[PDB]
Amino acid sequence: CGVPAIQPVLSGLSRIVNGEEAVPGSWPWQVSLQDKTGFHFCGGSLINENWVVTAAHCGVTTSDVVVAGEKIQKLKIAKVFKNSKYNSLTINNDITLLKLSTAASFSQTVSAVCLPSASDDFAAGTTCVTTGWGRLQQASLPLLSNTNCKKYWGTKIKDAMICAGASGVSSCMGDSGGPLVCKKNGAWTLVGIVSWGSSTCSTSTPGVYARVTALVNWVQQTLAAN
């Protein structure tokens, strides 16, 4: 997985501001999630032909459509897997999986990102990327210390939230359920599912995601069956 057919073109804008726009097929697992009337409110990542991982605040239901990639796949939901360490008062272990009713048809412009290991770590100063529509842009962002992070988001940083950005460039392109990815053994892997960011969308504040690695196994076990 994670070895995209058309390759992410990441420049300097990346680094900067509001960042930049990609090369289509670029972030191939990026999905949109449209509401019953083609209104998009969240989008998310594909790991397979059949599942999306996105956030649970996205609060996504079985009449939301997976929009992937019309060279597009609108993929309807079959069941929605939200999970119980789902706390909204906190928005933590903010993960939700989706079964689409009819497979994702793998091609150049649509594929799946890889999943990480639970043991894997991830490096603060490590250069990951937000894709989004919050045309679809790509921005680049280092993850940080949940204790650095702590100091930028108070009390709302627990076990499984993992923070990333605040380096002159901005969190916010990052729509919810959206993808925050890194490297391994050269695949991109989903590290962070987008939770939330700076209002004013300061380019000087860090952005906060959910941490896969802490939830992979739940993906893992949840997956598997259903």
> Do residues 140 and 37 share a domain?
no
Would 107 be classed as within a structural domain?
Answer: yes
Would 172 be classed as within a structural domain?
Answer: yes
Can you read off the two tokens belonging to residue 75? 């993929």
**H or E element in which residue 190 lies:** strand 187-196
- Phi, psi angle pair for 199, to nearest 5°: -55, -80
Can you read off the two tokens belonging to residue 200? 């004013």
> Do residues 53 and 89 share a domain?
yes
- Phi, psi angle pair for 222, to nearest 5°: -70, -40
Would 7 be classed as within a structural domain?
Answer: no
Looking at the structure of the chain, the number of domains it has is: 2
> Do residues 119 and 206 share a domain?
yes
Would 181 be classed as within a structural domain?
Answer: yes
> Do residues 103 and 152 share a domain?
no
Report how far residue 65's alpha carbon sits from residue 23's, in angstroms, rounded to the nearest whole number: 23
Contacts of 51 (CB under 8 A, 6+ apart): 97, 98, 99, 100, 223
> Do residues 120 and 22 share a domain?
yes
What range does the domain containing 50 cover? 28-112+214-223
SS3 192: strand
> Do residues 23 and 119 share a domain?
yes
> Do residues 106 and 117 share a domain?
no
> Do residues 108 and 121 share a domain?
no
> Do residues 22 and 63 share a domain?
no
> Do residues 173 and 88 share a domain?
no
Would 207 be classed as within a structural domain?
Answer: yes
Give the residue numbers annotated as catalytic, written as ranges: 57, 94, 176
> Do residues 58 and 137 share a domain?
no
Would 152 be classed as within a structural domain?
Answer: yes
Closest Cα partner for 28 from 114, 112, 132? 112
| CB hemisphere CA count around 3 (13 angstroms) | 4
> Do residues 47 and 132 share a domain?
no
DSSP state of 205: S
User: Is 210 in contact with 193 (CB distance < 8 Å)?
Assistant: yes
Would 202 be classed as within a structural domain?
Answer: yes
183-186 long-range Cβ contacts below 8 angstroms, 24+ apart: 184/114, 184/116, 184/120, 186/3
Would 75 be classed as within a structural domain?
Answer: yes
**H or E element in which residue 162 lies:** strand 161-165
Report how far residue 114's alpha carbon sits from residue 181's, in angstroms, rounded to the nearest whole number: 9
